[PDB]
């Protein structure tokens, strides 16, 4: 297991990164410092997470301490839905750069294919509770992302939560200049994504798996929901390998040639989650884990099911 995967822009991306959604602003600076200290070189960020300034403090301190060089880090962020208008994309990227205290991002993703009305609110609502869409086409948003590469603000661009027809729409865009480097999608043993992964990989697009532990801290968790970390079948595979269940859940996507971005603000877990380059799941283990698929999503963007670009009506 090599530590990085080659992207279609010629850069190498670390296959294991630190997630930062829900990481409290008072804890995420230390989390990122610890992560870098214990070997992480890839941090997954987003403007909508509201903690990029604090993530940036950690990155900057480790650069200043010369724990790492900038060229060794792979920093990812995402364009929020209220900034899909072509005239807002650069400013959104620049705000993220300012907060992260960087002069470029390694990868910048369209966070969702759905554009929303611009404004202060991340989920602008009509008086009846529906999210108010933007009329900006995702192909036009893509062209705006391409400009960021050409202006030196980002080294690579990609997409997130795009279904295969939406990926196809970009790949078939008239005058396409840069293909997406990455599609970041939810993926774990309860949402195994065989079809979409195969499609993306066949096109040279690297897939990043989010919520690989099943996001137990997701705000809308219900007591009766399935729980990967507590699944006795996964615990058994972990026990066989003398690893934790979380370590198996992280190793699983790695062996599918995916990038994976487990989130933690707990120093012991941050270190645990990185210690996954010292064992191998068998083919049988892999197929067994795949067999647990139930098409269960942490992130279904339920407020946007009527949006013309809602991604999860299609089978994949
Ligand atoms: N593109 C998108 O739309 C999108 C959507 C969702 C997520 N993401 C990205 O993917 C990242 C990961 O997904 P996620 O945050 O939803 O959930 P996750 O990484 O599947 O799970 C995070 C949860 O697991 C706990 N945890 C971490 N390591 C553990 C371990 N070794 N043992 C036991 N529990 C452990 C964390 O607790 P503590 O933090 O308290 O240690 C936290 O409650 C996000 O942070 C974000 O960067 C992107
Ligand atoms: O994008 C990710 O990583 C994970 O999803 C988010 C992250 C955020 F920081 C902020 C909102 C979301 C998100 O999609 N919420 C969905 C939601 C549910 C209930 C009521 C309002 C919004």
């Amino acid at each position: 297991m090599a530590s990085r995967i080659l992207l279609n822009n010629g850069a190498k991306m670390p296959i294991l990164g630190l997630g930062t959604w829900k990481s409290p602003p008072g804890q995420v600076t230390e989390a990122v410092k610890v992560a870098i200290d214990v070997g992480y070189r890839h941090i997954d960020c987003a403007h909508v997470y509201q903690n990029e300034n604090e993530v940036g403090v950690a990155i900057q301190e480790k650069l200043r301490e010369q724990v790492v060089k900038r060229e060794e880090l792979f920093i990812v962020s995402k364009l929020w839905c209220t900034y899909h208008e072509k005239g807002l994309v650069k400013g959104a990227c620049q705000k993220t750069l300012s907060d992260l205290k960087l002069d470029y991002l390694d990868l910048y993703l369209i966070h969702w294919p759905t554009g929303f009305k611009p404004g202060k609110e991340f989920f602008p609502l009509d008086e009846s509770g529906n999210v108010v869409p933007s009329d900006t086409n995702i192909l036009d948003t893509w062209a705006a992302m391409e400009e960021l590469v050409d202006e030196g603000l980002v080294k690579a661009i990609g997409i997130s939560n795009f279904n295969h027809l939406q990926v196809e729409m970009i790949l078939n865009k008239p005058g396409l200049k840069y293909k997406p480097a990455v599609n970041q999608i939810e993926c774990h043993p309860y949402l195994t994504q065989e079809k979409l992964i195969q499609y993306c990989q066949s096109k040279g697009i690297v897939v990043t798996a989010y919520s690989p532990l099943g996001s137990p801290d997701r705000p809308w968790a219900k007591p009766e929901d399935p729980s990967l970390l507590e699944d006795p079948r996964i615990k058994a595979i972990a026990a066989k390998h003398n690893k934790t269940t979380a370590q198996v859940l992280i190793r699983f996507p790695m062996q599918r040639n995916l990038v994976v971005i487990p989130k933690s603000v707990t120093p012991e877990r941050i270190a645990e989650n990185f210690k996954v380059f010292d064992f191998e799941l068998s083919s049988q283990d892999m197929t067994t884990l795949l067999s647990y698929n139930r098409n269960w999503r942490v992130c279904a963007l339920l407020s946007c099911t009527s949006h013309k670009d809602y991604p999860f009506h299609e089978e994949f």
Side-chain angles (χ1 to χ4, degrees), residues 20-22 44 46-50 78 80 111-112 122-123 160-161 184 210-211 215 219-220 298-303:
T20 62
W21 173 39
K22 311 171 262 63
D44 183 77
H47 177 67
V48 78
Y49 301 166
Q50 299 183 225
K78 317 188 190 76
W80 185 248
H111 203 146
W112 290 86
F122 291 154
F123 284 85
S160 184
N161 302 296
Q184 179 181 128
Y210 77 65
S211 305
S215 198
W220 48 83
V298 166
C299 287
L301 204 71
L302 293 179
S303 71

Side-chain angles (χ1 to χ4, degrees), residues 10 28 41-42 68 93 129 158 265 278 292 297 316:
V28 74
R41 297 292 179 266
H42 165 191
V68 286
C93 186
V265 291
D278 64 344
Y292 302 154
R297 294 183 188 274
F316 74 103

Side-chain angles (χ1 to χ4, degrees), residues 101-119 121-126 128-136 138-194 196-221 223-229 231-234 236-241 243-267 269-274 276-293 295-314:
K101 295 160 277 285
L102 299 173
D103 56 14
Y104 67 93
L105 296 173
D106 296 274
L107 177 63
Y108 197 47
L109 305 176
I110 305 182
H111 203 146
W112 290 86
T114 52
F116 304 165
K117 179 190 167 185
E121 301 290 347
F122 291 154
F123 284 85
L125 307 181
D126 61 32
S128 302
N130 299 290
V131 184
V132 180
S134 170
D135 67 16
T136 292
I138 207 59
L139 298 184
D140 290 326
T141 306
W142 188 253
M145 297 286 286
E146 293 175 325
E147 293 191 16
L148 302 177
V149 175
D150 291 328
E151 299 171 304
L153 274 67
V154 310
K155 302 291 188 195
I157 51 176
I159 57 189
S160 184
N161 302 296
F162 278 49
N163 71 39
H164 91 283
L165 295 182
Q166 293 170 324
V167 178
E168 186 173 63
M169 286 193 297
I170 293 177
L171 294 180
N172 292 344
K173 177 185 180 300
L176 181 67
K177 193 176 186 181
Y178 303 114
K179 292 179 203 167
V182 166
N183 189 12
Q184 179 181 128
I185 64 177
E186 188 176 338
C187 185
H188 47 69
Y190 299 157
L191 184 71
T192 51
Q193 301 271 28
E194 282 94 332
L196 184 54
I197 287 169
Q198 174 60 19
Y199 178 81
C200 291
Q201 294 184 334
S202 80
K203 300 298 184 183
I205 301 171
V206 166
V207 174
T208 301
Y210 77 65
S211 305
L213 311 181
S215 198
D217 60 338
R218 66 199 181 279
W220 48 83
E224 65 275 10
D225 289 347
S227 166
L228 287 165
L229 287 166
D231 188 319
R233 303 171 295 180
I234 307 181
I237 291 169
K240 182 174 67 181
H241 290 278
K243 285 290 174 174
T244 69
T245 302
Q247 288 167 326
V248 168
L249 290 169
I250 293 161
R251 184 71 191 194
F252 173 56
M254 296 166 67
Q255 290 187 211
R256 303 176 71 194
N257 298 311
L258 313 178
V259 175
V260 62
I261 53 171
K263 173 267 179 182
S264 182
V265 291
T266 303
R269 291 169 170 178
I270 293 165
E272 174 179 310
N273 290 352
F274 202 75
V276 290
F277 295 88
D278 64 344
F279 80 110
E280 306 172 21
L281 297 166
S282 66
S283 174
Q284 181 176 12
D285 287 333
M286 294 293 294
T287 297
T288 300
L289 289 160
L290 287 167
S291 80
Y292 302 154
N293 183 57
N295 304 319
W296 177 76
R297 294 183 188 274
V298 166
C299 287
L301 204 71
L302 293 179
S303 71
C304 299
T305 60
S306 287
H307 193 293
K308 71 168 160 50
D309 299 310
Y310 181 76
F312 307 141
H313 295 318
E314 285 293 327

